[model samples]
Target: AKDYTNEAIFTQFDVNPKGLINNPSQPIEFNLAFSDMNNGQKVKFKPGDFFDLTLPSNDEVSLRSLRAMGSKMPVLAKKEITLGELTFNGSHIHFEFMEDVLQLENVTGTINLKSVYDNAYRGEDDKIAELPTNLGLGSLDKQMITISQPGTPTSPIFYWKTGTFSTEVHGDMNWWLNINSPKEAVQSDVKVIDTIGEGHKLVDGSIMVDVEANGELKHISAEAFNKEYGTITVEGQVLTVMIPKEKAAKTTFTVTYDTRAFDKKLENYKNSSTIEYKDESGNLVTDTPKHYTDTSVVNMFDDATIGGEM
Candidate 1:
């Protein structure tokens, strides 16, 4: 009346029946009771044979390691094995791995080499199951290398590589600006803004301004670049500037006009300006509009002027 289905099962050979076979110093033995084979294939070698393996330090369980253990055995026992989810990540500023720490003996859990299925099985062929040969053996560690003469004389060899794969954006917006005060009134009230980067001269007549709620502008003009490649202008709510092609490297623009009301209209969403220019590809691209909220501001306002009046 005893149900053996729930009982623990042992599939690999080890030094102890009750303990694990994880020690790197000990010879790993095969378990005779592990009769479960892949694809219902039978085992040709005796169940009590020995298998040599060691612990692998990696986040992902390399299918190569599984093939390495199996290919060492007789062809009839060769098959890929898989272990469930193997993933890990960690960072260490300073760490050490001494030799004593690596060779220390200890028993952990056992691995089912047949659990992983990444290693190739029977490719296009239907008759014989092939062990994946592309598994790379980087450097032989403390573990003994499995070297059984290959299964066939006609067999081919495969070399594998474990490759690792990173991109970038460049430049600073070095800048310029314009502001209004109670000094000059609103006449010649023109404002100009400039931004810098890697490519293209500003295009002429491509400047325009957009105003937000409670925004106002008067006496507007078109954007134009001089021989030096620089020009400035103003519209309803936008103040724009441009640089000619010849002065692609030399730049600055100026605009003179009139303003009606003066408040946070320039600093809030009330104002924005944009221009067109040849991109790095030489294709005409519209420059991003500049707004007061998007750029830094420096106040040179002489608040100290009120000191003597007190």
Candidate 2:
């Protein structure tokens, strides 16, 4: 099997940035939709409260598995990601991520969402990043600007997300010619569970994430697998999550895209990475579109419906 990692681009974008545009209501529209896909999780914060989330994945199978059940089971992989930062600029929001480090390759794709309702704990709340009526967004949530659907009202506008489990991985037992293709036996899929809502508007924002992990290598006999090779497996892994100190803006409201936003040079990144292992090269996958079409790059919306740089 072709290294599926090459077919996918691992990038991170803002939750709902469109909410910042000329006081657009698109941010909250998308946040609520994305939260639904993940079972309505919560992230809350007050003024000066730090916010962070360690997104959970469904990838339990790694390249180091020794024994095989011949059956592909459900695995959720947890990746430590930096979801950027946000702050309130009046009722609007402003969010920002790096042009290069976010892992985005083409930096061009369509995103669309549909938010129904979210009053979780927004009572007497100035910032909505924490819990207790604080509606928040998480990693991997689909983003969209649904200002107006078929028959929806234009005054209220709309911005939301709708995603599902499409994450998949393919495997091959004996295709590597022994040592020539050790990585060929693996491939993974990223599924968009649903849309995420990060409120409306954009202000200066900042987010910092750091994690430390340890793994032990295990040894397995080649004869066990009817093959003549020694398998090195990670026995166990210990991970620590930390939010480092950094300087960034924490604006209010969310910023979102009504159409695909592309103006800068696209950086292509491709490699083998998991929640446990990482490719420091941090490359992009330019040829990725042909393979991972469902991967959300931008939102599915109209230009007239959205307001921004294009």
Candidate 3:
């Protein structure tokens, strides 16, 4: 079986095909050298984590599983590796082989890590969308590999499962990309804003919009995503919404900015958001520039400093 989801694409190759070397060093050392094979044990991995093994076909008997993550994530330096799986706070291990079909001649290790990936999608991407590539991260821990050694290295033994394992990984297979490909809205922040007063003269104020999209965030400030499939706009400062690509998948949008930035004693009320979309070739792309400012600083002869609105 193959319970894979969301268009799986896991490519990590180098060490001549076993892949993983463009610039590794920060406690990072992934060496896997083997021979005829037999009984081998020494496993400890992190990242998304995974493990499973059992093979031998007579009347039918085979089930293999091994999942892995942590090849990317605002990574800076977490080097030193000996062969996948070890992220999410810790990893690093020891071994001995040949029992079911686990044999080797050499399989060293090292991964303190440090290749390069700063805002690689801070927290997975809500903002910060480009310009900082390389350092491909480092995945494949629980086992989601398929390297039949076509890249070639004179065949030094790298078999893949027939049991809990098998091999065929060569070099230069490093392509870590999941660059936030959902709805693609990145993020626009402006938590809240409200202003209204007349005592010392400081009128007009109302704004509280929170938008975040890369996949789903219906509408507010005119609201939509309910009364039948998306279409909401809030004129004035501009708050448009109409996402129904397939029943609208909305991600986050708490709206209420009826247009009010009053200025008679105006101190701060910054509101900026320009995000319009249509990109698969539709052309009509809009830059995401969202901001929110309302420091609430009023002291017009003190009506108790005046601060009370919604």
Candidate 4:
């Protein structure tokens, strides 16, 4: 049987994006550095030797992926590295060495992780979310890893916006909007109104809508969407999507479209959108407007000038 008590010392534990919003849609990266325990006599890692790292059980975070690499210096000619295989259990990660690791060699591991946004793990007066430290390893079991808790979106309806330049056209841009609600059930008769900014025209037949609910996303067929959920209409530069009272109560909406610039000389284009809905008391409410911008630029220089700078 492989011994589980071999000692290892942690030299570094670094986490990026030290803070995150609750239930973030993105993942963070962890870089860990460790070395073998040196007791005057060098310690050698046999082929079957492995390291186990216990993760927090509080449901605040989960590992997405992990990998390990080993390298030795001064003696090796090419400085070749060894890769280790990693397996994740319910609450721990097992990193197993495939080959013998030289005595006193150092190892580094990386983990991609996702964290949840919840108030349960936070202190009453604390503004940040703190995970319990002292996670377990062989000898370095008291390691501490902390992530900050930024405030979540406060509005009933909020949005995420992004834009990318079109690949086929130099001055064209693609825009995506994710309109979300903090509540589980949004009121019916919601309207998503997007106004294209000046110098850009909405591309014809480029509008698409997808509904996300119950952890599944489904594209709404243009005909079925218009008939069932709401009507999509474009008047000049303004695009309005009206979700009727029936199908708008339980779904989050995403909209994607393309825009073309009238003149390619402009470097940036800006657009804005808002959501309109009615509260339970039959009062109409409009959400804060969200804005997005797409930009393009070109740099030109003579070959002789570039060579002179070089």
Q: Pick the candidate with the highest lDDT.
A: 4
Q: In candidate 3, what are the lDDT values of residues 95-180, reduced to their tens digit?
A: 22212112222322222221111111113223312111112222223322111111212211111000000011111011110111
Q: How close is every model to the real structure, measured as TM-score?
A: 0.19, 0.15, 0.18, 0.43
Clash totals for all candidate models: 14, 88, 76, 2
Off by more than 4 A, model 2: 1-12, 18-109, 114-117, 122-127, 130-310
Model 1, 229-266: lDDT tens digits are: 34554333444554345433212222322222222212
Candidate that beats the other on TM-score, 2 or 3, i.e. the better one: 3
Measured with C-alpha atoms, the lDDT of residue 138 in candidate 1 is 22
What would the per-residue lDDT of candidate 2 be over residues 84-115, giving only the tens digit for each residue? 23332222222223222234221222122211
Q: What is the lDDT, from 0 to 100, of the residue 31 in candidate 2? A: 26
How well does candidate 2 score on lDDT at residue 170?
16
Error of 2 at 36 (Å): 27
Between candidates 2 and 3, the one scoring higher on lDDT is 3
Every model: Cα RMSD to truth: 28.7, 25.9, 25.9, 13.2
Q: Which regions of candidate 1 are displaced past 4 Å? A: 1-228, 250-261, 264-270, 287-310
